[PDB]
Structure formats: structure tokens, C-alpha cells
Amino acid sequence: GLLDGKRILVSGIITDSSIAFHIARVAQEQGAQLVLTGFDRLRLIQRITDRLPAKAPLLELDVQNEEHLASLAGRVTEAIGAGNKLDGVVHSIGFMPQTGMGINPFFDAPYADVSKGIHISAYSYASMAKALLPIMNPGGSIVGMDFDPSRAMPAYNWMTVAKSALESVNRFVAREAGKYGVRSNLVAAGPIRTLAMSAIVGGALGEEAGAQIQLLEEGWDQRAPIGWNMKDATPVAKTVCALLSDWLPATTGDIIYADGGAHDQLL
Amino acid sequence: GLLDGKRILVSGIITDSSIAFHIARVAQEQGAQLVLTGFDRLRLIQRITDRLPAKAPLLELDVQNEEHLASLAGRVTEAIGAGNKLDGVVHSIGFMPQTGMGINPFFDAPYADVSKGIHISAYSYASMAKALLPIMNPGGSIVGMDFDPSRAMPAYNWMTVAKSALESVNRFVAREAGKYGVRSNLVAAGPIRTLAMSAIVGGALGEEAGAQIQLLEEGWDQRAPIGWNMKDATPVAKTVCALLSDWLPATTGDIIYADGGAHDQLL
Amino acid sequence: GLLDGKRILVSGIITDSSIAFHIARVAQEQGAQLVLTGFDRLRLIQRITDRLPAKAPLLELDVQNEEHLASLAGRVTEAIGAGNKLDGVVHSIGFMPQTGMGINPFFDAPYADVSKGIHISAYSYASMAKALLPIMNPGGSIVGMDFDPSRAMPAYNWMTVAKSALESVNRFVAREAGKYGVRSNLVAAGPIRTLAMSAIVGGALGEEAGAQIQLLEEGWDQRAPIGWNMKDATPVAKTVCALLSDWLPATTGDIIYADGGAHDQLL
Amino acid sequence: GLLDGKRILVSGIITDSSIAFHIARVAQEQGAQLVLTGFDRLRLIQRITDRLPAKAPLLELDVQNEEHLASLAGRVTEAIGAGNKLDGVVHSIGFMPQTGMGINPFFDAPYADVSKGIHISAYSYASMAKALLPIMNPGGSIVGMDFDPSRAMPAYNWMTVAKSALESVNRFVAREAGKYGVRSNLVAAGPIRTLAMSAIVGGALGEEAGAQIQLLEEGWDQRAPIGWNMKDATPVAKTVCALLSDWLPATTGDIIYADGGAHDQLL
Numbered sequence A, B, C, D: 001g002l003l004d005g006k007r008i009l010v011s012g013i014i015t016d017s018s019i020a021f022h023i024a025r026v027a028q029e030q031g032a033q034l035v036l037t038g039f040d041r042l043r044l045i046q047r048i049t050d051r052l053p054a055k056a057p058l059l060e061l062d063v064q065n066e067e068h069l070a071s072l073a074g075r076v077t078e079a080i081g082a083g084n085k086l087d088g089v090v091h092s093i094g095f096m097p098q099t100g101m102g103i104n105p106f107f108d109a110p111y112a113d114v115s116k117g118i119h120i121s122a123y124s125y126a127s128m129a130k131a132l133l134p135i136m137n138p139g140g141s142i143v144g145m146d147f148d149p150s151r152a153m154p155a156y157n158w159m160t161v162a163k164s165a166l167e168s169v170n171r172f173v174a175r176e177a178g179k180y181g182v183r184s185n186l187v188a189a190g191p192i193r194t195l196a197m198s199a200i201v202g203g204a205l206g207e208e209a210g211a212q213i214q215l216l217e218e219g220w221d222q223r224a225p226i227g228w229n230m231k232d233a234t235p236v237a238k239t240v241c242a243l244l245s246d247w248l249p250a251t252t253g254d255i256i257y258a259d260g261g262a263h264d265q266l267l
């Protein structure tokens, strides 16, 4: 029971192939009591999360909605019971308008589109920490999902820029969270075949972008000394759970790579 | 004559202590023919640039203004003469609303403020490249100003996040500029006593932020094996000129540190 | 029981303040069956390890001794029983002759001294992997101890160089270990008050080196958003155990920072 | 005349395809007065350097020879004239025994071989700085040649480890050189078709190593936004000259990448 007795909020579930779905499942398998947040399609999300090993309250959260964020801590407290606080928070949220990715030229993404993507994908990590820190216990843990942006790559375009911003935000959140005895880290995962990504490989963002992303994935498994299985989010979910546990108690403002070791190898 | 015969656009002059003022002066000393761009206070900027060693046309450019950007290449061509192209572009532009810096808590910066700062400080590097690449010669060079954001620090807050985004943007601009035979790099400078920074040390953004920034500067000179003089922008200007020259012809998508070597030393 | 059922070799115990002593203790608390290796003073080491929660066989290993390394796998198999293999290996070994550290000038360390330090501190990580991989199970884990060498610092001198080499060796060991389904990682720890380090703060390597190291420690706790306690090796031991567990199964060739978050913060 | 009036020592010439040969040629084209050092085959080296644009004294230097190093400053002073000092030093020296590279397994390199390679390839950067700093002018520059070792790669094996050590040594040399008003930097170059490398592509170190290195080169040009020509050392030589000039006066303990931008791009 890695997370026995811990109360953990998990955002970012939209389908059963969501990385956050697997994070939630493994966390419950390890004894965590969950509260879920979902964006927009709550009926869908409730139906999806019915399949989790245990029941978990579902709260609505649009990270671009200031009213949602202002009320979030109160709604969470209602859900877990007055006198109880969170031990863990999982940020598994990301989005970039199509103009900011794929075959649409990098220079052709309008700032309003870029700004929306950075809002949801980077700023909201700070938004969620602001909302939830006042209801977190000492020794608590905030975790976000990263895709290694240290080098540029085809197709990912402005989403890669958004991840660069997220990594910087994480280091500042660590400074704030430290006052509460709370850690803040990112997990940089290898590529995972979510619905959206499958759609992209299938050409949803242009044939050229599809081809490059497919090449990107193949080179990843090739580089990874222990391989990489894009169809399996479990090793990622387990890593997130390691950061939510008491077993990395001196790590904060940092990035843990769950990518098969691909980023440490050139060829 | 390091830049003999080169035509170079320099943005970012606002006072005589602007880093871009020193970049422009050294470039002219080295034989460059300049075109300047300025934001908002053009009468002031013209009066300031009258002091440069040579005359240089001044064009208006608000990087948040789409009309300015759409017309920029045409206005530059008018200024340098049909048939002539730029060999160099200097981006020396940065801004973050006060809510995103200083003693104002990190979590209290409203996204609209953050988004404005990222627009001017990061996105606009791509905006300027889009506008100017069609009028740049092969072997050309685009340079932007960076402040090392790889670690978080007091007071700089969201401006540090904006610089993280800028570094990512630079790597993508390099991909685009490469098609034109053009390089794109950043110069990461140590802290420089511009008007704004002097104002901040003087408490303009809060006493606590002032104190931290003053401590930040002192530790910098201490760490730098060859020292660091915050009152002297010349070593920075020379580094920018090195990148505009033909002498780093295989460097692109990169960051050159002009910081006295401070970033490579821990204590 | 984080390590229930796992068989783990732990090197590097010399006193009760050794980092490896705490790694061994926490591992036993979590259900691991240990085999220990020790260098030179085996009577001392046996007497020290008598205090561990459980009994554990002690084998002699001088990593500079080719005969010791050639026989190591056989002696380990004898200790754990034919048919059984290791699930984990901890490398907690480091040394640099005094000429390579402290107030002795950097340029005055003779290569023979440097070479000895690099042999014990970096090459031996590969030596131990070569010896033990043939007797490790798939899903196994090799962990070594690192001190972040990405920036230079006073006093540590050639030991910092040795750590840079170690980090590079780790990435190559990951390539080799991957063929066995085995991971290889380093834990970069903050400074810990071992006997040797206390001796150094006390002036054993010169007053100037003592003063700098004491300053180094103070700045560390200051920078760490969750603080850093140099007198407590437990948070480091727990991190090593996390890497020996099944909970970071997609991380290899990497560095996990157990340093209070100090390395991600500038001031 | 980028280097007009400067006196510069250049090591590492062995054939006309040596990177140091091109560094020397470009430096002379830019007005530098050179002193050369060579290892072992001095008749060959003299005959090769006869082809440089200007005459230059050739001194013998085996960096593993303490007598050579002890006498080096005296011999250089003799060559350039009492009262004159060096403004620049180029370290272009590297070697690793065959057991430490290619298809020979990583684990099978004997430490004595590794230690020799690290001595010549990393330690000697410090050796040369120790010897020459006492005869360098303020504003002087020391430059060494690097091959980016931040990620592991096939075939390069222990030479990659040696480069990791070199990068760490450079940061410490910067600390020492700073007391003399002297800078120390590395140039990380893309792969260059020297004699040795051609031999390796041709299978001199095994067919598998040959194939991997050939693949390595192809991916490099592919990744580089401005391309990479392995048959042309000139862009590398020019970058080294930029660091020897007065145009990067605030850069020390650093690495400048002359690699076509390949290291900043993933695919």
C-alpha cells in the first residue's frame, strides 16, 4: 500500500486512455483515496471513471475559469470532509489549438491561440497550486506531466514551448509549496498513444506531422536502453505514484524522466 | 571592421543605458549600417539615437501590433533601398507587468498580465523572425537577449518564465531560419544596470525584491571567474556583434553566455 | 514492504555515518535481503554492520583489485544461494587523494593521484556492473551516489571532475544493463556530515577549504525550498530505495536529485 | 585582421586534415603570430606545417611527459622573445586506446587504457594551462576541443567519458585562469572527417562501430538546421578564432557549440 491513507486530487481524465486515468487506477490500487476533477464533459468523465477500482467524487474544473478555481478548495473540502486535507495533487492537463501544432507553420500560430495553450498547459500548474496548497498537509506532493522540451522537434511546435514554460513554472511553484512543507515536481513521459495522439499519427494534423510523430516514436523505443512501449501508460502512472509517496522526500522543483531512458542517449 | 558592409536592424533602444543602445554603438564602430526600430516614444528614441556614431533610420514597431509587423519588411526595404536585404537582426525587447515581478506574490499575477509579458518577451522573437526572414541574406544572423532562466530566483518571477519560453522559441526559430541560410541565437547576459533595474534596486517593485536583486548582483560578480561589472554593457554588446559576424557560422538555435562565467560556477 | 523479497548488494559502509549504512538500514526496514561488501577494514565494518536491523553477509571488495572483482559474482552467489540472483546493486564508493582536494591548488594534483580517484570514484561503477549484471534479475536496479558536478566549486576540485566522469559512465552502464532488463541510475545528494566531511569542515584539508565547504552547506539549506539537513542521511537513503523498487520502472541512465531542491534554485 | 598582433600557441597538428591545422591556418590568415607544439613525429609535423600561410616555430610536447611540460614556458618564451607573452592557447589534443572505443565492449576496457586516454584527453587541458598561464597576457584566451558528451552514444564509449571529464576540467581551469585575466572555453564540434575518423568509418575499429558512426554523422546533418559538412573543418576553426579574439570577452568556463545546431534539435 504505497499510498495508504493518502488523499489525492487527480485532474485530467477525459477517456480511458488518458494518462490520468492510469495514474488514478494505480493510486487506488495502492490505497489512495481520490477526488477527481474534470473539464466540460462531466457525464462522459463520470461514466469513464465508474471503471476505476474504487468510487471517487468528481468535481468540475475548467482551469481557465476563475470562479471554478476560487471555489475549488471549498468543493474539495466538502468532498473529503471538513478537517481533512489533501496529501497529493496531480496536474495532468494540456492543450494547444491546432494552429499551434502539426503542419500549420510555426510562424502562423496567432498569439491568441498560443496564449490559450500556455494558459491551460503551463500557467494552470500555478493556478492549481494556488487553489490547493491552503488545503494540503506537510509532506504533501504536487505532480505535473511534462514532455521533454529541451530540444526542438517537428510538429509539437508551440506545445513544446508551452512545456518549456511549464518546467520554469514548476521551479517557482516549488518555492511557494516549500512554505507548506509540500514538494512540486514534473514527470517527463515518453510518447503515449492517447486518443489524441492516435488521431495525430492518423493524420488529423496533416500527413507530414503524422509521419514525423511516427518517426519520433520509433526513434524513442530504439534509443531507450530498456525500450519504450507507447501503448502502455502504466510505467508512467507508477512513476507519478512514486512522487506522491514518501519515498522521494528531498526532491522538489525537479523533473523525473519516465521515458525508457531515451533522453540520455543520442543514438 | 567586424561588421563591414552588413545591414543590421536593431530593436529595443529606449534610453542611453539600454543594452540595445550599446549593441548599436559597437555595431556602427565595426562598420555596420543600421536600421533602428522603437516602441511608442519615438521622439525620445530619435533624440537618444542622435548620439550614435552614425545616422540610422528609425522605424516604429510595437510587437503587439499586427499592422506594424505586416508592414515592417516593406518599411525596412524602403529604408535600406530596394534590392538590398538585411544581414542581421537584433531582438532586444522585454517586458512584464509589475504584477508578474517583485514582491507581488508569484501566484497573484493574473494571466492577462503574464500573457502580455510572454507576448512581448517571447512570442515576439518569432513575430520578428517571420517579418524579417523574407528580407534576409544567406549567412544572416538573428540574435535575442536572454537572462538565464534554468533555475528559479527571487523577484524575477514570471519574467524568468517568459525567458524559459524565449529559449524554446529560439530553437524553433532556428529551424525556420535555417531554410534561409540564417542563424538564430540568444545571448544570456549578466545583470545590467539599466534605468529599470536601477529603479528596482531602489525599491520600485518593493523593498524585499530590491534587496534580493541587489544580493543577486553581488553573488554574480563573486562567482564570475573574470568578474562582472553591472554598470558596463559593452562586453555584452561585443558578444552580440560576434554572433552577427561571420565568426560563429556553425552555431544556431543556441545560447551564448556573456555573464563573466557566473553560470558555470556554484560558489 | 517496499523491497519485500528483493536481494540487494550494498557497498560503501565504513562507519555508522556512511550514507551506505543508512541505505542498508532503510532497505532492511523495507524487507530487502542484503549482501554487504567492504573495503580493507573488514573487522571494523562487521562490527559496524552488527547494528543493522537484520544480519547480512559481508564480502571483501577493493574495486581496484581485479581478483576481487573476478571472484565477486561467485562469492555473492555462495552468499545468497545457487539459483538465486540479485535484484539490486548499490554503489556507494568514492575517494580522491588529498592532493586532489581542498587548499592544495587544482593544478598541483599529480595525475597518478587523480587517476586513482577516478578509478575508485567513476570507473568502478562500470567494474561493479560488469561483475554483477550476469547475476541480476530482469527488472533489477543499479544505483550509484553522485554529487552534482555540473558547475565548478571551491575545494571539491578533482572529486567534482570524478563525479562528472561518473555521470557519463552511468549513461553507458544503462546501455549495457538494458540488455539484462536492468536499470542504472545515480542519486545526486546534498552534502552529508559523514566522518570525512566533518573532518574537512574542521580543517583537515586546510582552513580555506574548510571555510568554503561550510559556506557551501549553508547556501544549500538556504536555496532548498524544503530545506536541507546535512546531519540526516535518511531522505537520501529513502530515495535510493525508491530507485531499487519497482516504482520507477521507466527511468534509466538518469540522475535523481535528493538535495532539498537546491540545484533548481539560484538564490 | 581578427587576431592582429596576438601571439598564439596551437597544439594538436598531426596531419593536414587535423582540426588544429585549420585552426592554425585561419588564425594566420587573421594576423596571429603562432607557435606550434607537436607530439612524437616532429619531422612529419614540420613538413605538414610548412604549408601554413606563414612560418611558425615548432616545439615538441608530449602531454604525458612532465619534463616537456616543466620546460614548455621557457621554450615558448625563447621562441617568441623575452618580454613577450602569449595571448592565446589552443588545446586540440585527444586520444583513447582502441580498447576504449568501437566494438570492443565498454566493460572490457582495462583501467590502464582508460586512464591513459583521460590523461591525454582531459587532464592535459589542466596541465597545459598550468604551464602557460604564467606566460599569458590579461585578456588572453585558452580554448579546447570538445565532442558533446551529455548523452551516451555507440562506439565513442570511453572517449565520451573522457570528454565529460574535460568539460568539468574546463570549468575549474576557468577559475584558475581568471586570476590572470584569462578566459577558458571549449568548442564542441560536429563530427569531422580526420584521418582517424575516416579510418573508423572504414571499419578500423570494427564493422559495427563503423556503421554506427556513419549513422551518427548522417543524423547530424539531418538535425542541423543549417546542415553539417563533416568534410569541412573551416567553420570549426573560425569559431575557435572567435574565442581567441576580443569579441567574447565575458565568456569563460563555457562551451560553444559549432555543430550546425544539431545538439538543440531532437529530430
Ligand SMILES: NC(=O)c1ccc[n+]([C@@H]2O[C@H](COP(=O)([O-])OP(=O)(O)OC[C@H]3O[C@@H](n4cnc5c(N)ncnc54)[C@H](O)[C@@H]3O)[C@@H](O)[C@H]2O)c1
Residues within 6 Å of the ligand: A011, A012, A013, A014, A015, A017, A018, A019, A020, A038, A039, A061, A062, A063, A064, A092, A093, A094, A095, A120, A145, A146, A147, A188, A189, A190, A191, A192, A193, A194, A195, A196, A197
Ligand atoms: N500523450 C503523450 O504522448 C504525452 C507525453 C508526455 C506528456 N503528456 C502530458 O500528459 C498530460 C495529459 O495528457 P494525455 O496525453 O493524457 O491527453 P488527454 O487528452 O487524455 O488529457 C488531457 C486533459 O487535459 C484536459 N483539459 C484541456 N483543457 C482543460 C481546461 N481548460 N481545464 C481543465 N482541463 C483541461 C482535458 O480534459 C484532458 O482531460 C498533458 O499535460 C500532456 O501534455 C502527454
Ligand SMILES: NC(=O)c1ccc[n+]([C@@H]2O[C@H](COP(=O)([O-])OP(=O)(O)OC[C@H]3O[C@@H](n4cnc5c(N)ncnc54)[C@H](O)[C@@H]3O)[C@@H](O)[C@H]2O)c1
Residues within 6 Å of the ligand: B011, B012, B013, B014, B015, B017, B018, B019, B020, B038, B039, B061, B062, B063, B064, B092, B093, B094, B095, B120, B145, B146, B147, B188, B189, B190, B191, B192, B193, B194, B195, B196, B197
Ligand atoms: N538589464 C538586464 O539585467 C538584462 C539582463 C539580461 C537580459 N536582458 C534583456 O535585454 C533586453 C533589453 O532589455 P534592457 O535591459 O536593455 O531594458 P530596456 O528597458 O532598456 O529595453 C527594453 C526594450 O523593450 C522595448 N519594448 C517593450 N515593449 C515593447 C513592445 N510592445 N514593442 C516593441 N518594443 C517593446 C522597450 O521600448 C525597450 O526599448 C530584454 O529582453 C531584457 O530582458 C536584460
Ligand SMILES: NC(=O)c1ccc[n+]([C@@H]2O[C@H](COP(=O)([O-])OP(=O)(O)OC[C@H]3O[C@@H](n4cnc5c(N)ncnc54)[C@H](O)[C@@H]3O)[C@@H](O)[C@H]2O)c1
Residues within 6 Å of the ligand: C011, C012, C013, C014, C015, C017, C018, C019, C020, C038, C039, C061, C062, C063, C064, C092, C093, C094, C095, C120, C145, C146, C147, C188, C189, C190, C191, C192, C193, C194, C195, C196, C197
Ligand atoms: N557525504 C557527502 O556530502 C556526499 C554527497 C553526495 C554524494 N556522496 C557520495 O556518496 C558515496 C558514499 O560516500 P560517504 O559520504 O558515505 O563517505 P564514506 O567515507 O562513509 O564512504 C565512502 C566509501 O567508499 C569506500 N572505498 C574507498 N575506496 C575503496 C576501494 N578501493 N574499494 C572499495 N571501496 C572503497 C570506503 O571504504 C567507504 O566505505 C560516495 O560516492 C560519495 O562521493 C557523498
Ligand SMILES: NC(=O)c1ccc[n+]([C@@H]2O[C@H](COP(=O)([O-])OP(=O)(O)OC[C@H]3O[C@@H](n4cnc5c(N)ncnc54)[C@H](O)[C@@H]3O)[C@@H](O)[C@H]2O)c1
Residues within 6 Å of the ligand: D011, D012, D013, D014, D015, D017, D018, D019, D020, D038, D039, D061, D062, D063, D064, D092, D093, D094, D095, D120, D145, D146, D147, D188, D189, D190, D191, D192, D193, D194, D195, D196, D197
Ligand atoms: N574529428 C572529430 O569528429 C572531432 C569532433 C569533436 C572534437 N574533436 C576533438 O578535436 C581534437 C583534435 O582531434 P582531431 O579530430 O583533429 O584528430 P587528430 O588526430 O588530427 O589530432 C589529435 C592530436 O592529438 C595529439 N596527441 C595524442 N597524444 C598526445 C600526447 N601524448 N601529447 C601531445 N599530443 C598528443 C596527436 O598528435 C594529434 O595531433 C581532439 O580533442 C578531438 O577529440 C574531434
